Design a protein around this ligand. Structure first.
Ligand SMILES: [Ca+2]
Length: 223
């Protein structure tokens, strides 16, 4: 997250870190057994880390639970990043309390102008590299479909939306991928892609979670 703020420990209780020996992507806990992330974060051997603030220090609220199964969206296209969503099942159910909690799925799609909370452990610099150990946060609005398409000609599908600031300086970034965009207490986006980070006229692009609620529910119901 570039141009954000330190969230505070366990203030984003649905945020998870995907770990394969190291943090590599975010995700969102949607029930005791299941995490939403980006399909482009797929790999084998995932350990889901819940209750994290500093990802390099054991602070006392963590739950580390190996994944039993990953399910990339049936229509994920890694070239275009269309349908950049996956589900990860935990080998055992997480214990839920105020610091580790699921986030609700949307019942309707959010609108341009709505304020959301984007979070992650990704790079905090737009030029060069610095990775935080504690969770960063950014409040940002959803942008119009027209301004999103004008920013990224030929690239924005109906399964994507832009959020952030066209002036630059505030955005998600590498290492945030797969993490949440939460608006009015609902998971509306997944950190997906963008041109660089926090560049002028290059806002963040997010998977549009409301399009996937029926797939998510039916997949969980049978897996
Ligand atoms: Ca920790």
């Amino acid at each position: 997250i570039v141009g954000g703020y330190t969230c505070g420990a366990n203030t984003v209780p649905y945020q998870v870190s995907l770990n394969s020996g190291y943090h590599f992507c975010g995700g969102s806990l949607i029930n005791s057994q299941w995490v939403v992330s980006a399909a482009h974060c797929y790999k084998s051997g995932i350990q889901v880390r819940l209750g994290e603030d500093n990802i390099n220090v054991v602070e006392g609220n963590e739950q580390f639970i190996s994944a039993s199964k990953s399910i990339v969206h049936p229509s994920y296209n890694s070239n275009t990043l269309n349908n950049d969503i996956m589900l990860i099942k935990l080998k055992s159910a997480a214990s839920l309390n105020s610091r580790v909690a699921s986030i609700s799925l949307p019942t309707s799609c959010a609108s341009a102008g709505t304020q959301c909370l984007i979070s992650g452990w990704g790079n905090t610099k737009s030029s060069g590299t610095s990775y935080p150990d504690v969770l960063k946060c950014l409040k940002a609005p959803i942008l119009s479909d027209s301004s999103c398409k004008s920013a990224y000609p030929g690239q924005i599908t109906s399964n994507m939306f832009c959020a952030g600031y066209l002036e630059g300086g505030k955005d998600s970034c590498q290492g945030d991928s797969g993490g949440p965009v939460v608006c009015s207490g609902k998971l509306q986006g997944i950190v997906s892609w963008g041109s660089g980070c926090a560049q002028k006229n290059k806002p963040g692009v997010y998977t549009k979670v409301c399009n996937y609620v029926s797939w998510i529910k039916q997949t969980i119901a049978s897996n």
